[PDB]
């Protein structure tokens, strides 16, 4: 029968930090992660600043032999899943390795490495394309090398639902542990697509933010003068494990992951349903699986990315939902400060909304100067509000119409 | 307690035909699909040749509008998936819409799009890539694209892990079904991975097969002259559905899907361990799934991807797993015909492991000239062997170690 699914342990990269507790920092102080692209010279482009993660040390984790190898994302996501892992404080084991597995996904994965290779081949050759081409760049890889380093035999797989990602990799992988596939599983997200096919595709699609000019304002959920999303850069995971585990080894426990919904839009390729009929459709299973009341939310870390329909939808969706209780809950978008980490948005921010409900207090949704028509909830405009937090809900759509949501409660 | 999955419909391209039952065909007379790649300048790559899907009309599924936005690998999966969905019969209403989803995934995703963008950005720079270069190259958009067509509002994701893509896909698609998130679920996978990207970077790694000279005899899983893999294009799908949902529809089921097995190896990016161990796991693992004894088995489709070392720990885990029972079922790669089709290769595997269910005739393995030192099973060499089938496995082990084994039996 169905077992319970508890957060043990948790790390990141982000545009506020190296880690958890300095992103939490800077996500509490209303900080901005955007800045103007350093890494590469997009004079020709329409975009030209995210949230990169600043001065990270890939020799806190990897030998410089192995990194060199490896594309960003899966530097990131390997970061980030041995953070949360030694957060855990587990021991792996002849015991347990087999019950221990891992997922952790990418929305683009390794664009960076497949669009220098891609280069090599085009001017020089196949000749010069990296021997390590397919394993340093193919999705899986974040998984497949965190499990060769820690030793984990456990299930181990990807999801790439585009913007959803981090979100069904952590959901799903408490599905695992729920139904005895394993006991302890690592899943989250990460995503470096700052590249030129990354920054380029984005633009040809004129999806992002063009306030070049102002970088720390450009991401403005709900803000009736937000023009499209920030492209970021990161990693988040998480350490879930079942519950009567996590007792007897005696871990600390962050929160309780206690719903989960997925949902398709079926509406359209990359556009939301005005209405937010996927989100409401997905929000609701995620309630019902949680067992819960809609009245127990009290703080819901919205997709939010910035775009003009994403966010109206998401507005329209929470008070389907909700009905009048939407008035009395929070809501806020972190990409007010981070911008969209893409395949590992749902991964942060499900860190953020178990640390929301450590500290009871609900982020800020930075630049929400002039809310738009019809965005008039609790949206935490400017400043963090300390608040009763027992429920928490994450929230991520995605390309394909693909809805996710995780709903956490605090543990006792 | 959990409910019973069983496949009512299937679809497919493969380089032996464009749906199921010209492939079926092939497969049973020892037919090779590989040959040398067309319309490419290939004269500085060490391999030339593979398996391309012939004479695909995408404008029978698309509008050639709709098409121009899609990735061939997303056309091939939207293919397989729309045939698999009219084999099945299945009307979907908006009483049943919310209980069918889409689970169809990829191994490398979208390369030709890559290219194609690479050229123009390098070229004439970023302002000339496409606007549908993220929505139409992003491994979710079968399913995405899959459930906008068909109105499908269940369960929506993709699976990314690599080689083991197609057989993680169905497996977690009929969890999906046996707990009751969804009543009916399109998975499998698909893959265009020829391209120069493909070719080169697979190339790099010298783990393709070289020999240009007379490629249908190139893939030849357990020969002792096996030079490595052949790189194939194609996808499968599969109808997956609770049976009292099946019945109560009249639908045709071809097979039941009773076990799924996952493991990781937790040894290599991209060589499995010798001696199979997590390949060996990952079996006994869908057996016990399935409550079956070893002794049970009739028919493994192998993962058999003619690479020296691959091929080898797979004669080591089945020994392991089935003792005195090793020599008595039938193993057989399907890949000495069809070269391997990475993320798609558990998709049209499984479609072939229900088929040899069907009708009762284990598959060859051709090209099997000379078994390799300790390749002593029953590997069915060069021709097709009518035999009892009552119950077939399907394994796939890909780069990362990640292993997956879906366990088939007869219905009635
Ligand atoms: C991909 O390159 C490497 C990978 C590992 N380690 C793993 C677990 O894969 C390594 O460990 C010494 C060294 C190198 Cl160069």
Redesign the pocket.
Same mark, same amino acid.
């Given at each position: 029968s169905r077992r319970r699914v508890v957060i043990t342990g948790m790390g990141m990269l982000s545009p506020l930090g190296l880690d958890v507790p300095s992103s939490w920092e800077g996500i509490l102080a209303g900080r901005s992660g955007i800045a103007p692209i350093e890494h590469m010279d997009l004079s020709a482009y329409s975009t030209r600043f995210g949230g990169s993660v600043k001065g990270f040390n890939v020799e806190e984790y990897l030998?410089a032999?192995?990194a060199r190898?490896?594309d960003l994302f899966i530097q990131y996501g390997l970061a980030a899943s041995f953070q949360a892992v030694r957060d855990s404080g587990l021991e792996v084991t002849d015991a347990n390795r087999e019950r221990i597995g891992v997922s952790m996904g990418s929305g683009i994965g390794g664009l960076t490495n497949i669009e220098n290779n891609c280069r090599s081949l085009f001017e020089q050759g196949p000749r010069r394309i990296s021997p /390590?081409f397919v394993?340093?760049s193919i999705i899986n890889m974040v998984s497949g /090398?965190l499990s060769?380093?820690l030793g984990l035999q456990g299930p181990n797989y990807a999801l790439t639902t585009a913007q959803t990602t981090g979100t069904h990799s952590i959901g799903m992988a408490a599905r695992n542990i729920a139904y005895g596939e394993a006991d302890v599983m690592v899943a989250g997200g990460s995503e470096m697509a700052a590249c030129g096919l990354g920054l380029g595709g984005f633009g040809a699609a004129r999806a992002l933010s063009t306030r070049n000019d102002e970088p720390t304002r450009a991401s403005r959920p709900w803000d009736r003068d937000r023009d499209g999303f920030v492209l970021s850069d990161g990693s988040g995971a998480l350490v879930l494990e079942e519950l009567e585990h996590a007792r007897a080894r005696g871990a600390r426990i962050y929160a309780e992951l206690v719903g989960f919904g997925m949902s398709g839009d079926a509406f359209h390729m990359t556009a939301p349903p005005e209405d937010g009929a996927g989100a409401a459709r997905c929000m609701k299973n995620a309630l019902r699986d949680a067992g819960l009341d809609p009245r127990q939310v009290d703080y819901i870390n919205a997709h939010g990315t910035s775009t003009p329909a994403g966010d109206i939808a998401e507005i329209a969706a929470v008070k389907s939902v909700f009905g009048e209780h939407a008035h009395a809950l929070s809501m806020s978008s972190t990409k007010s400060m981070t911008g969209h980490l893409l395949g590992a948005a749902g991964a942060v921010e499900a860190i953020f909304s178990v640390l929301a409900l450590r500290d009871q207090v609900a982020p800020p949704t930075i630049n929400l100067d002039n809310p738009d028509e019809g965005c008039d909830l609790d949206l935490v405009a400017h400043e963090a509000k300390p608040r009763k937090i027992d429920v928490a809900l994450s929230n991520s759509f995605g390309f394909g119409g693909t809805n996710g949501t995780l709903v956490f409660r605090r543990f006792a």
């Open positions: 030998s032999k192995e190898k490896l /390590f394993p340093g /090398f060769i380093h």
